[PDB]
Amino acid sequence: DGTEKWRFKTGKAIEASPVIGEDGTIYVGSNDGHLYAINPDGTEKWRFKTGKAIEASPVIGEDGTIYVGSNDGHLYAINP
Amino acid sequence: DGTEKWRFKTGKAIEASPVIGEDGTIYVGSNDGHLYAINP
Amino acid sequence: DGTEKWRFKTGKAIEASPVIGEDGTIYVGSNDGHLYAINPDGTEKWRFKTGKAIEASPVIGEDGTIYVGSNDGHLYAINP
Amino acid sequence: DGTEKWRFKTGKAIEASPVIGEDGTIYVGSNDGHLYAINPDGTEKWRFKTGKAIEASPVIGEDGTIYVGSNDGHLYAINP
Amino acid sequence: DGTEKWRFKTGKAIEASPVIGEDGTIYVGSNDGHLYAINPDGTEKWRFKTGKAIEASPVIGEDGTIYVGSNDGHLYAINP
């Protein structure tokens, strides 16, 4: 098929692969400094602001915690 | 067989590898700022 | 034993890791704008020309489709 | 629900994904030259200093040894 | 306990994550153009020289072949 299901616009370029959680939530970091949690249907579940661009994919722990590094120098642990 | 199945255009370079969902949906980020969900 | 088995020349730098399919075919992107399919014995199986350099590894789906991004802004779905 | 669980500040931008060990320890490299080992509760377990920025994710061997490359040209092997 | 087990020096910055083979061999690329094979105890097993810097992690095939791309435009296949 190859058609578009949906698109979600962030404020700046996305430089790292998205990560999919166990429940289907798609997590993606943007150069706009936010980590976005997007539902399978394309709506926004939540966004988490860091002070600078996120250049690397987040990882998910056993309990669902999402860990992501930021250019602001912090490692964040986010409740899913 | 090396042939093209389809192509999906974004507005800028795609710098990161795509990922595939459980149902086959293909997710990819673009330098144009969007996360795309593409049907296989 | 550290010896060379073969080498496959592309026109420009290779910035991303190759991926290996189920049948052993080795896929690699190049800054010369092509996605290469290389046989285990080092010969070329096929090549697919894109628009600009490929900076990220190809991803292979369950049905063997090879997906690859490009600096030309497109995501390509390539048959096995 | 997208809320912050904790944050851990390093000296400089984190350019690579964190890696999680078997016990839940989160390892992450920083441009400040250190590899950090962060406990699940956000406290620091240890830090390991290299001479230059760490631009790529660490990897863990089967016995727990943590391997990380540095811009200082060295590959380090760190005890858990 | 966060201590150094060993270190291995290469000529230039290491920009990509190392990979580990089944037998414990640690493979890592380097901007000095070589792919290094390092034993679990930190000693060198062998090295393979390419024309230019290696920016991406090597990939190990089912048959043990180590594949690595170079900025010199070639994809190298190296015997175990």
Query: Rounded distance, CA E28 to CA E35, Å?
Result: 6
CB contact under 8 A, C32 and E76: no
- Collect all residues of chain B within an 8 Å Cβ-Cβ radius of residue A15: 15-16, 29, 31
Please state the φ and ψ torsions of residue A40, each to the nearest 5 degrees: -50, -30
Technique used: X-ray
Find the helix or strand (DSSP H, E) in which A64 lies: none
Closest CA to D49 of D10, D9, D18, D7: D10
Please give the DSSP secondary-structure letter assigned to residue E15: -
Residue E49 in contact with partner chain C when CB distance is under 8 A: no
Chain C interface includes E75 (CB < 8 A)? yes
Chains in touch with C (3+ beta-carbon pairs under 8 Å) read B, E
Neighbour tally for D32: CB within 10 Å: 18
Resolution in angstroms for this experimental structure? 2.3
Would you call C11 exposed, middle or buried from its count of C-beta atoms within 10 A (0-12, 13-18, 19+)? exposed
Mark whether C and D touch (3+ CB pairs within 8 Å). no
- Integer Cα distance of E8 and B27 in angstroms: 38
**In chain A, which residues have their Cβ closer than 8 Å to the Cβ of D38?**
75
Question: Tokens representing E4?
Answer: 């150094």
> How many helical (H) and strand (E) elements, i.e. helices and strands, does chain E have?
0, 8
Cβ contacts of C41 within 8 Å, gap of 6 or more: C6
